[PDB]
Amino acid sequence: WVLLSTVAAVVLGITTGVLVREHSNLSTLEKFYFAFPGEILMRMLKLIILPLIISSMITGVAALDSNVSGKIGLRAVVYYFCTTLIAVILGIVLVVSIKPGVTSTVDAMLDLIRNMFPENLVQACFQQYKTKREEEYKIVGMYSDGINVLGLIVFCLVFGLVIGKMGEKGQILVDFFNALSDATMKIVQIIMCYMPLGILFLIAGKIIEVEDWEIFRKLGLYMATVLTGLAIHSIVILPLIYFIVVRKNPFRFAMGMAQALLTALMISSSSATLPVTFRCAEENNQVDKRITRFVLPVGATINMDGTALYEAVAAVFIAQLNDLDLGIGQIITISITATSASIGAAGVPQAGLVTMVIVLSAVGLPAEDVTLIIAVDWLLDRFRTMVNVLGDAFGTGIVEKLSKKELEQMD
Template sequence: MMRRVKTLSKQDILLILTIAGVIVGVVGGGLLRYLNPNEEVRKFIGFPGELFMNMLKAMILPLIVASLISVGWDHVRKTGEKSCAILCPHHSSCSPGLIIFCIVMGIVISRLGKQARPLAKFFMALDAVITRMVLIVMWFGPIGIPSLIACKMLEVYDLMATAQTLAMFILTVVLGLAIQCFVTLPLIYFIGTRQNPYVFLRGLGQAVLTALGTSSSAASLPVTFRCLEELGVDSRVTKFVLPVGAMVNMDGTALYEATASIFIAQLNGMDLSFGQVLTVSITATLASIGAASIPSAGLVTMMIVLTALGLPVNDISLIIAIDWFL
């Protein structure tokens, strides 16, 4: 038994503690509803969660800046001017000022070569430091998450209606991800190669299971490399595409953040126009690029999307309760 415990990775332990925190928050919040605590007691209960949220908020700006500048520099450095021409139009037409500035700055740093190499190394190091800091902050989750959930349960008037709404949210996200994985991506593969995409997907089974188990695209990279090598994909392609894709190609995160933002807007009685839904979709896509390829980092960038809509970021506590599952 002790040997099995020792083989658990830090990510496994964090996931177990997070799930335990969710259970404690739900049970504790349900029991506290019967006691009907006053406002001061509610603030005391929610204080650890508020600290946790403030730490997450503090990560937003450095995470976005360091990640996007590093991606812009590394992408152009490895692929040259052609990729610069591809990357820039994709973002420049609709991105917020900060995101476009960071991407362009990374590209310019790459074009300057040796002259700007110290600055490039600084942002690469900063990206690594911020990623580690996000991981450290996430270890406070098992303390902050029960506080947030319990406090939110005390504020919710109709608990059963909220639970039903959350169930519909989970169903919507899972359905969206299923369409992306089994319809959209295979269709793109078929159009590009004229081959059966599901045979290719079958060869990636171990990589998919690793990604599901670790909730991290970065952690599954070594397995993905091996799977693609066995499928006969050129190693020169995989060595470039996979690391960049682990940082930039966050389709699931973008879908999840957009759906969560619309869900929170509906909870607050806000009817979104077509323009606002479009804004949410674009902002979620761009914000997901800056999401570190570690578990639950999307919760940090989700705050950017909520801020763009003028929605309270504290409502993320409802999403945290089910984030470990999605």
């Protein structure tokens, strides 16, 4: 339904945007009031990212302290983090080399570490430390505005780790933030019911302001960057990581998953294709049932390889749409926030847009340009879910070869 009511928001936002621009004449003021229902959506999204980051980081890290089954549980979590970090790095490199959207460096890397450890937890919810080399030179910090996403991710990772080790003493803190993450995931679902009304007026506000045909050549080159990144990650990278640790011809392993990949296109949900990819791994690729019963359940909500690469591409595409280049201190902030968005969205396909707003707010990019991401998101969301279950599929074969001593011992 939500795909059908977002495609309807884009089509009726384009039809409104061309029957208003060609049949009327608005000033700079009426074009601001026309895009007002989308401005309300853009601050309903920013409203919810502060309890979403806090609750999902504390609960997701404290859940991983309880889900790790010794060495099989640790090798699957380690594998999910490297492939996500490789898909983000592949997404960063591809969008910087191609550059769709176009036409000191040591004080930016030290501002990265100063923002991971803020001087106050309450100011981290709305302010960021920025430093400035000036005057044989001095260095001055300012504490500019915008939510410090790195300071809240690092604190809630350390806080969520501590409560997991406390056990009985901290069970009221685990239970508090579990109910807090279930509550804000239901508010995110309320905002996503308003979202087709907001995307309609915010797409139509963009169609009024264009005079060129160059914004659509940039959106076509943005889709050809995500689809290039999803093709390099699924054919060149993820078969190679299989072949480094399992010398067993990774393309025969991928053809054995062919029934699970095609149903990842029709349903377009990585968690709703679980009972097909469970049997399609064991009946065909002869993987152990003990590894499959852990890797595929925790992997369908943690291993998001296609989503991480797409968010990395889309945030730098917005930062090239608005004429910036981000340096390097903002590129690492993309690469941490897009990687930690696996935990920061607690296994929900609804939160694909709001994790986009977390990545854009971690740098300071305009969140109103996310409608150009949403207007072509329905085309690419099918192919992200195919890569999200392929990294889960290749994880059952990789963790099994690494844990061959745990399968002669568990019997």
